[PDB]
Design a protein around this ligand. Sequence first.
Ligand code: HEM
Ligand SMILES: Oc1c(Cl)c(Cl)c(Cl)c(Cl)c1Cl
Length: 137
Amino acid sequence: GFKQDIATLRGDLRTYAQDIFLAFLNKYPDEKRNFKNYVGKSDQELKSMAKFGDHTEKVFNLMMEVADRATDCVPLASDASTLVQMKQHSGLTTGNFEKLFVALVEYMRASGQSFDSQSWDRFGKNLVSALSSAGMK
Ligand code: HEM
Ligand SMILES: Oc1c(Cl)c(Cl)c(Cl)c(Cl)c1Cl
């Protein structure tokens, strides 16, 4: 289930984080307007850029902490308010988080692995709800 999936992702996190984030940026190319430094690069080129690998791993590091702290795929209000208050997320709306979790769930659904895609879908919707409640537009 969901807990085992957090372990599975953590056991190869650099690779999972990079491949899921690339799936997000390729499914939703407009979302690069938040990452202007990633424009005009192929997947292989991005995976060569120090900040791509480091930023994406840190994102997933914190996403897995938030998922691990969740009950029944519902994140702590403390984690939702951290994600809202982050200066790095100044620009963002829940739609930005929605698209990332659509890409993550589609990635899990395409993988040959027994990922609980249903639970990640719930987690993505419940994090969007918690982000709105904590004052993200
Ligand atoms: C659960 C979902 C997410 C988590 C846990 C998360 C976490 C983080 C973290 C930890 C950083 C700091 C990275 C660093 O400085 O090395 C960061 C930066 C950032 N995040 Fe997020 N993030 C999430 C979703 C999103 C989404 C959906 C967007 C935009 C569509 C976004 C846009 C950014 C931007 C623009 C930065 C700063 C520039 C960059 O890191 O490349 N985040 N995020
Ligand atoms: O560079 C980044 C990567 Cl790889 C990911 Cl996955 C995310 Cl969510 C963000 Cl915000 C940045 Cl800046």
